[PDB]
Design an enzyme around this catalytic site. Structure first.
Site, PDB file in Angstrom:
ATOM      1  CE  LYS C 297      37.827  23.382  35.876  1.00  0.00           C
ATOM      2  NZ  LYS C 297      37.296  22.639  34.687  1.00  0.00           N
ATOM      3  CG  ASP C 305      41.428  33.146  34.822  1.00  0.00           C
ATOM      4  OD1 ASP C 305      41.708  32.316  33.932  1.00  0.00           O
ATOM      5  OD2 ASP C 305      40.896  34.251  34.583  1.00  0.00           O
ATOM      6  NE  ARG C 374      29.759  14.461  34.896  1.00  0.00           N
ATOM      7  CZ  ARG C 374      29.958  14.337  33.590  1.00  0.00           C
ATOM      8  NH1 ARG C 374      29.794  13.159  33.003  1.00  0.00           N
ATOM      9  NH2 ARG C 374      30.319  15.392  32.867  1.00  0.00           N
TER      10      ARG C 374
HETATM   11  C1  LIG Z   1      35.400  18.166  29.816  1.00  0.00           C
HETATM   12  C2  LIG Z   1      34.661  17.833  31.091  1.00  0.00           C
HETATM   13  C3  LIG Z   1      33.700  16.689  30.843  1.00  0.00           C
HETATM   14  C4  LIG Z   1      35.643  17.411  32.163  1.00  0.00           C
HETATM   15  C5  LIG Z   1      33.860  19.024  31.575  1.00  0.00           C
HETATM   16  O1  LIG Z   1      32.882  19.413  30.939  1.00  0.00           O
HETATM   17  N1  LIG Z   1      34.212  19.652  32.703  1.00  0.00           N
HETATM   18  C6  LIG Z   1      33.445  20.743  33.203  1.00  0.00           C
HETATM   19  C7  LIG Z   1      33.720  20.843  34.683  1.00  0.00           C
HETATM   20  O2  LIG Z   1      34.794  21.296  35.091  1.00  0.00           O
HETATM   21  N2  LIG Z   1      32.787  20.426  35.541  1.00  0.00           N
HETATM   22  O3  LIG Z   1      33.045  20.515  36.970  1.00  0.00           O
HETATM   23  C8  LIG Z   1      33.696  22.096  32.574  1.00  0.00           C
HETATM   24  C9  LIG Z   1      32.818  23.125  32.885  1.00  0.00           C
HETATM   25  C10 LIG Z   1      32.999  24.387  32.343  1.00  0.00           C
HETATM   26  C11 LIG Z   1      34.060  24.615  31.482  1.00  0.00           C
HETATM   27  C12 LIG Z   1      34.274  25.989  30.884  1.00  0.00           C
HETATM   28  C13 LIG Z   1      35.525  26.380  30.577  1.00  0.00           C
HETATM   29  C14 LIG Z   1      35.768  27.746  29.981  1.00  0.00           C
HETATM   30  F1  LIG Z   1      37.014  28.126  29.677  1.00  0.00           F
HETATM   31  C15 LIG Z   1      34.732  28.578  29.756  1.00  0.00           C
HETATM   32  F2  LIG Z   1      34.934  29.790  29.227  1.00  0.00           F
HETATM   33  C16 LIG Z   1      33.330  28.143  30.100  1.00  0.00           C
HETATM   34  F3  LIG Z   1      32.315  28.980  29.868  1.00  0.00           F
HETATM   35  C17 LIG Z   1      33.108  26.922  30.633  1.00  0.00           C
HETATM   36  C18 LIG Z   1      34.939  23.588  31.173  1.00  0.00           C
HETATM   37  C19 LIG Z   1      34.761  22.325  31.719  1.00  0.00           C
HETATM   38 ZN   LIG Z   2      35.184  20.520  37.080  1.00  0.00          ZN
END
Ligand SMILES: CC(C)(C)C(=O)N[C@@H](C(=O)NO)c1ccc(-c2cc(F)c(F)c(F)c2)cc1
Ligand SMILES: [Zn+2]
Ligand SMILES: CC(C)(C)C(=O)N[C@@H](C(=O)NO)c1ccc(-c2cc(F)c(F)c(F)c2)cc1
Ligand SMILES: CC(C)(C)C(=O)N[C@@H](C(=O)NO)c1ccc(-c2cc(F)c(F)c(F)c2)cc1
Ligand SMILES: [Zn+2]
Ligand SMILES: [Zn+2]
Ligand SMILES: [Zn+2]
Ligand SMILES: [Zn+2]
Ligand SMILES: [Zn+2]
Lengths: 513, 518, 513
Positions: C297, C305, C374
């Protein structure tokens, strides 16, 4: 000394250091310019300006005791050249005794008073000639006005830029003699050996910084500090992890968690033979490599390849240790401190969001693992104040924002005590290492109020990160005069692709005067 | 004078409010040793507790009412503390059997309140005025303030209390009501009395600037802004001159004109003058950056975080100068001659715009290579500065939303000042202290001057690529003042109050104090 | 169950507050008929004005104190307005010359308040509680709320009133009584102690979420889950790596490979004393820190963070376990499941492109290591279905795209069974935790067709990530009613800088009804 760990057997286990440099073998003589100049050997360079006439012609006023050179230096010949700052010309010729000599000049502009930046350009022009010169002697004739400090600066800079670091390598020849013609030579003579000392302190710092992070790690760097201390007869103590755990330095220890090298806290001490009337702690940020941690330096312009320089603060403090240990000031006790570690990405690394506890009990919420400098400094500052000193001065490659505020020439100083800041500013003036006073704006303090911890490591919004970082550090100095020097912008010479060793002379002037 | 329109719905003037509800407030100051009368409205005590953080509330003032005095006894007040910014409301009946409202605002445990501390206090007081239909406010000073701080209290109270509804239509505040009376109790009141109307003058100059800044770029354009400045000048009986494009061409202002080339609004150079009657000891030129909208030009503000929607703010410097013109024209200082200047234009994208790489010629004959169209401010200032020095003045002070890098150096609270003259710089800092508009001295580092060396033109407009932009920009400006004491105030970081989502009107009080005390 | 440490200062458990000051508050509910008594503390009237937006405040209730009645007369209150969240309160002497505070909170001009409106009302109330030293708060309802919204008022009040100080060190006085005046008080009294239970379930989840990743790791979180199970007399079982290897959970285990903490699978069970007529598995995503892995990230706005929150789904499930274990519903068997791990960067981490095998034999091509949720859920879902349950409900901070679809207020629910989905929607209405039904679009399934593995982890193009993720999870539930709640956007209260504890009351209402 400690054994530095290796991944493979080809990994180096110490920092190569040059103590005896060709600069130290140069015999320096200063003559008064009123008596005329002797031009019989090697390279002779006249430092010339032309006040009022921008880029005006060169005119040599000094009388020289050689008929051949006197003719070369005649006004009709010299007016073919001009005094544009940094411009140089030099010619090879036979003198009266049919010996090969070289004669030339460096333009010093049209302003009588040279800034340190002006003088630097003059020196660089001179050094360029020296790097293409094999003659045994250089004579510099000052037909310009410089004061004692600037003349010492001239020598320091000349020595520093002349010297080439070849430790990691697998034309010219260093001169054995330097001659100087300047008005009232007698008053400038005591600057010579002070300049030679200031030179090596600066060059030593440079060697540590330029040393790559596989060579220069927390163990090899603390090892080097011990060897330096032993050579200078300084009291030394290296604190290991178990001691650091016992002192509860959670902020400092957290940063090093992801590194293969154990944290090493460097504590050197100079104590005067006589009555101790002032105690000072010098604190240098000692990150041997700043990857950024999980907040990895991956953004464009983050320049991860530069980050071996993140121990520049430590290097400056150690360089100052050399100067102080060599010049041996009286009535002072100085502690040279650095919480040395490496900031890496690992299963073991600390995380953004982690709440860690400093050695003074304050809990800290980590917003950014790449703001790791102030965490190490926080525990170092608590360590320093426990020593019971009069002044605490830290120096650190702390914030990238310095590049956008003061730039690459001037470092910034912040503090809780106006007198201490003034002493630093005065030290900047006499060392000719430029610093500018920046404010600690209290209105921004509220941004460090953490929801869960005692305090935040960084702001989320403010953007004035150099000031905010200062506000964080201030929380770990309770009742001692303290100053903070941010050298993140000025530490590296990007044009010349090398360190400056910035801070050494500034910090030494501070303790000496 | 005629504002060009694209459609008939385009506004042809900036709506300006002169007679504000603040001007309808009758202000009376009474000496506190006479005792306070609590009869009506709301009565707020400004109380602190020296040395005791979160210390108890104690009302030390003599209250000329048996019932209210009984209420405010230490025993009843002990439950409340003086934490800076905290406040409480009280409800009771006085001796006349009338219900009265009383309260307090905590001023902390410090003996001397800073700039930020006092503004916190005022903001707490303002929360007590909002959402409460009151006809009168009484403020009792039980803290010590000097005259400048007392004035700062009033100015800030007026400014924050005031609500700008010029662009409201269907969403005006139905419950918007202003007090008609302000009572003030303070030690040695006669000393402070003269500060009252000075504060009201300082309030409006600041609020007026605020009105111009807040006004969007479709309302506030180079033509309508210069039209507003004329109307102001006419009201103050100041001399005024507006220079049109043909005059600007005659004066060879190629830098200034090039910036405005891409705009549908013609460039307008504002020149107001205040002249004291009698002996003129000091001549001053005040120069404000007057970009009515900064799109960036072909170097379009498209990068993340460039905040193009803020860029109506880029005439904040001009607004400050005009606000100062109001204050100076109203207070009528003696022994001075002040020139109020602004090279006003709009930085837009067009077939007619200046291009990156263009070489333009300033009015002092220096050719300039444009490296970034979004550094348009220093270009307009260059010609404005040359114009200023031709006036033969003692001081040149410019004020400008010049570099975003100020956000990284000093941030949102402190403005930066640069200059070629230490005495002038010191006067600016002094004026900063007495106006309570914070400024910090920043260096003009001559070593960076080399980076403005151009291969083809006399000088580079910018960059390549020092990064210390605020300093490089100052170095550039220096090239257009030849032999006059000059100072430059970069307010790019402090002009807009992001938290409150409104202008500060920064610099009006600063410049006025500079003029009044020089 | 021993938490590994890098240094001795690394925490080895999650601090938990079980006994909170909220639990010491004595709640009395009175009928608004017969008038209100004002004897001490703070008395707040909840007031609206249907007739006029931002209209005047008017108090309708008879107050049995003459002094306060005089204060509350129409001529005085009309100076104030009912704009949602606006408040005023005054100190005065009542008939007994006792100091009392009386005020109001504006409830706007709409007769029926939404959960968002009510939360704004409560926040205004809490601001007053935090700024006054009070032994008692009295709330007079001159607005209309049903039994569920009233409970919600209490739950929200308790939650927002409570301050988490577990991580405060060194850089008071809650109310002891709560009185409520409301029409038909008798029908509302039973909501009180239910609200207190719902409060702590939510606050307990909040404590786990707010706890940083150095305190809350897979080992200490599972340990925490055991302690909870022991206090509630729930059956518990923590599956370690050996067992997980035996169960062939390759997707789950691959994610945790780069962590210093071993994977821990939490399995708590509640079983009713009578005949079991419904079996339910609740599955919570339990990533204690999500660095993103090798897909770090690092992009702007990725907020690394924040990523201690990635176990919010697990915390909601455990918080539900508290409520269910306390209220003890009949003829149900509930399994509380969480595949807990940490997603880190290491020599040992799984890589982009890796093909891994889930416990149902399906090979998965990893396209992005930051889509790790997932993968853990995949093996958790297989585990859940093998328990032979009637409903499977997973709750997870799964996709950032939720911010772009429903935002920060409404979670999304996906599913394979309309009956289960409607039940969740019903539970959303009664818990007042807003959820919106989103489609699983079968046309997008083809994008998950891997060239080499049985299935792709992610789509390479179909930007509907929340839907694509639901399609992936669907492949691991073969013959059971299943629903999926994506709380990635709603879990963290960004404005208040704290967790919501979202999902506890939602899931509990689902089990209870
Ligand atoms: C873009 C992908 C498909 C990689 C995704 O959705 N990743 C999620 C993840 O890390 N799963 O383990 C994910 C989940 C939450 C967030 C997220 C980011 C922020 F800055 C926020 F403020 C929030 F509420 C959720 C971003 C990506
Ligand atoms: Zn993730
Ligand atoms: C922006 C934050 C707050 C993360 C920051 O100041 N970080 C500094 C840091 O890593 N401290 O440990 C930091 C320090 C120096 C630099 C830096 C980057 C460059 F590309 C340079 F050329 C330079 F001189 C300094 C950037 C960030
Ligand atoms: C980067 C350069 C040198 C082009 C620059 O400083 N430009 C300024 C400019 O456009 N002059 O005409 C500039 C001025 C203000 C800001 C700015 C941007 C924000 F998002 C802010 F919030 C703000 F306060 C100032 C950015 C750049
Ligand atoms: Zn860093
Ligand atoms: Zn660093
Ligand atoms: Zn611009
Ligand atoms: Zn601009
Ligand atoms: Zn995740």
């Amino acid at each position: 000394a400690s054994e530095v760990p290796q991944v493979v057997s080809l990994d180096p286990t110490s920092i190569p250091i040059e103590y005896n440099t060709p600069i130290h073998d140069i015999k320096v003589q200063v003559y008064d310019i009123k008596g005329g100049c002797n031009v019989e050997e090697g390279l002779t360079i006249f430092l010339v300006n032309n006040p009022g006439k921008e880029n005006g012609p060169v005119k040599i006023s000094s009388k020289v005791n050689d008929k051949q050179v006197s003719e070369f230096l005649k006004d009709e010949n010299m007016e073919k050249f001009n005094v544009k700052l940094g411009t140089s010309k030099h010619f090879y010729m036979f003198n009266d005794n049919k010996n090969s000599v070289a004669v030339g000049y460096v333009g010093c502009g049209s302003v009588a008073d040279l800034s340190e930046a002006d003088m630097k350009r003059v020196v660089l022009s001179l050094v360029t000639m020296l790097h293409d010169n094999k003659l045994s002697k250089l004579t510099v004739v000052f037909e310009i006005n410089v004061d004692k400090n600037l003349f010492r600066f001239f020598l320091e800079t000349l020595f520093y830029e002349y010297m080439t670091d070849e430790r990691f390598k697998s034309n010219m020849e260093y001169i054995k003699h330097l001659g100087v013609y300047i008005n009232n030579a007698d008053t400038y003579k005591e600057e010579v050996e002070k300049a030679r000392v200031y030179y090596f302190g600066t060059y030593y710092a440079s060697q540590l910084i330029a040393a790559p992070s596989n060579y220069c790690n927390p163990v090899s760097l603390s090892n080097a500090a011990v060897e330096l201390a032993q050579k200078l007869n300084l009291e030394y103590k290296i604190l290991g992890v178990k001691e650091l755990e016992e002192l509860k330095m959670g902020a400092y220890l957290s940063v090093g968690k992801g590194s293969m090298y154990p944290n090493k806290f460097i504590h050197l001490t100079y104590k005067s033979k006589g009555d101790v009337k002032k105690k000072i702690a010098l604190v240098g940020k000692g990150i041997t490599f700043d990857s950024g941690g999980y907040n990895l330096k991956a953004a464009p312009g983050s320049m991860i390849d530069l980050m071996k320089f993140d121990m520049s603060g430590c290097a400056a403090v150690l360089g100052c240790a050399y100067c102080v240990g060599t010049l041996k000031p009286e009535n002072v006790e100085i502690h040279f401190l650095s919480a040395v570690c490496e900031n890496m990405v690992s299963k073991n690394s600390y995380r953004p969001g982690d709440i860690i506890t400093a050695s003074n009990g304050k809990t800290i919420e980590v917003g950014n693992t790449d703001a790791e400098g102030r965490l190490t400094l926080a525990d170092a500052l608590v360590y320093a104040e426990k020593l019971g000193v009069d002044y605490i001065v830290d120096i650190a490659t702390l914030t990238g924002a310095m590049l956008y505020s003061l730039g690459t020439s001037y470092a910034g100083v912040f503090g809780n005590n106006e007198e201490l800041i003034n002493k630093i500013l005065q030290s900047s003036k006499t060392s000719n290492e430029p610093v500018w006073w920046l404010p600690i704006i209290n209105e921004y303090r509220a941004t460090l109020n953490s929801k869960y911890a005692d305090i935040n490591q960084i702001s989320s919004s403010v953007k004035a990160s150099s000031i905010v970082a200062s506000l964080f550090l201030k929380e770990f100095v309770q009742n001692t005069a303290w100053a903070h020097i941010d050298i993140a912008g000025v530490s590296w010479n990007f044009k010349a692709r090398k360190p400056k060793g910035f801070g050494v002379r500034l910090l030494t002037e501070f303790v000496l005067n």
